[PDB]
């Protein structure tokens, strides 16, 4: 029975190493993307303010043009 258990243990550790490796690459991929997601989120917010500012200044210029 020991010989049979040893055989099952050998292949078990091999599958374990493969599983952990797949998880290690998956958790890393999820991370780098999460960082990029937050990096893009900040860029989206800072530009969201610029877009509004760019619109308001345009409307203000039009109102300024109407006066003159």
């Amino acid at each position: 029975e020991l010989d049979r258990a040893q055989e099952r243990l050998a292949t078990a550790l091999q599958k374990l190493e493969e599983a952990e490796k797949a998880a290690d690459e998956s958790e890393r991929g999820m991370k780098v993307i999460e960082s990029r997601a937050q990096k893009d989120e900040e860029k989206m917010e800072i530009q969201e303010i610029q877009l509004k500012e760019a619109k308001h200044i345009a409307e203000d210029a039009d109102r300024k043009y109407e006066e003159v």
């Binding site: 960082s35 990096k39 900040e42 800072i46």
Partner: protein, 375 residues
């Protein structure tokens, strides 16, 4: 390869050495800069100890090594060890003789005049080097893109350099030298970990800190908002089961140390954040030079790979500075080898003859020949 002397390419720092074969694009052998003793007694007969252990040999087995740091910003506690460190590079891996090919090195800005001559003495007198040169870190990372107007900030383990080299070099002061890079970060963490009980004492595990750092640790976007986030245990508590056998949940420890970068007040100095030093190098130059500097800011050095290092710059620079031009920072993706890319160039340039030093040139103008003529 065969015809023509063919020169090598190298870039030595105060932490990691970069060197490969000849005519290459990137370093082929990057061994760590470590050399300690066997405070213990080697087995003493299970080899006549000596070899403080170095290269992948020492790094593989730190355990019984009292890692002695020879090169500390400027001062080299001992030169005798450096001789046998270079006797390993060119031969054990590259399998080529320096008594045949030229050599290229890097220059740490504002380094004692006596050092640049002591090194050359080792080459010309013993390693017989009829042709070599020592170029300036940052300037190399430059000549490798497509413009003659950019400001560069090159650093790694040695010291920080804010060099606005674009159209020319050296005028009033602009450039800055700050002893706060790499080794400084590795030294600061162990001190702060003591608050939680963890105390990586000896210099061997001190290196483990650096190893662990470059895998998960990141920079705080805003320490204020991230502090309140500590209440949650998802973005904070990070898993890293010690290869030995004891997990270290680096949660608030990851984005704590990097804060020192922007706040040098935590390391006993008056130096301001790296976004103030940026102004310090811009306000000095002419007035009609700024609008294009903001449009191009080169950030070299593998140190600038920490998550949350570039996005912070746009927040602090746009604050206390002119805001009607294109604020733009060029942070090369793999910016660690930016110096190596430029190094392979100088070694292949022909105009290089106008700059390099020849065997006889070292004897005619004496040892000072180098930095007495060039800059």
């Amino acid at each position: 390869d065969e015809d023509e002397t063919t020169a090598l390419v190298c870039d030595n720092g105060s932490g990691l050495v970069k060197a490969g074969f000849a005519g290459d694009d990137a370093p082929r052998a990057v061994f760590p800069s470590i050399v300690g003793r066997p405070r213990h007694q080697g087995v003493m007969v299970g080899m006549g100890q000596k070899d403080s252990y170095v290269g992948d040999e020492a790094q593989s087995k730190r355990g019984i090594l009292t890692l002695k740091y020879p090169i500390e910003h400027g001062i080299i506690t001992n030169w005798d060890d450096m001789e046998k460190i270079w006797h390993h590079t060119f031969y054990n891996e590259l399998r080529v003789a320096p008594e045949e090919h030229p050599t290229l090195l890097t220059e740490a800005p504002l380094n004692p005049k006596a050092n640049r001559e002591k090194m050359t003495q080792i080459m010309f007198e013993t390693f017989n080097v009829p042709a070599m040169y020592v170029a300036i870190q940052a300037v190399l990372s430059l000549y490798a893109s497509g413009r003659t107007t950019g400001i560069v900030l090159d650093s790694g383990d040695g010291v920080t350099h804010n060099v606005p080299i674009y159209e020319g070099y050296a005028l009033p002061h602009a450039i800055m030298r700050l002893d706060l890079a790499g080794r400084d970060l590795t030294d600061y963490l162990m001190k702060i970990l003591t608050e939680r009980g963890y105390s990586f004492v000896t210099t061997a595990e001190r290196e483990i800190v650096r190893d662990i750092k470059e895998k998960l640790c990141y920079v705080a976007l805003d320490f204020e908002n991230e502090m309140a986030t500590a209440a949650s245990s998802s973005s904070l508590e990070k898993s890293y089961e010690l290869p030995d056998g004891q997990v270290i949940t680096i949660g608030n420890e990851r984005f704590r140390c990097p804060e020192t970068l922007f706040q040098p007040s935590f390391i006993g100095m008056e130096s301001a954040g790296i976004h103030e030093t940026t102004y310090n190098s811009i306000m000095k130059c002419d007035i009609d030079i700024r609008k294009d500097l903001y449009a191009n800011n080169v950030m070299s050095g593998g140190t600038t790979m920490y998550p949350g290092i570039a996005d912070r710059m746009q927040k602090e620079i746009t604050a206390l500075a002119p805001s009607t031009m294109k604020i733009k920072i060029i942070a090369p993706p793999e910016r660690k080898y930016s110096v190596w890319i430029g190094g392979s160039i100088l070694a292949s340039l022909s105009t290089f003859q106008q700059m390099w030093i020849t065997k006889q040139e070292y004897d005619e103008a004496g040892p000072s020949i180098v930095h007495r003529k060039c800059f």
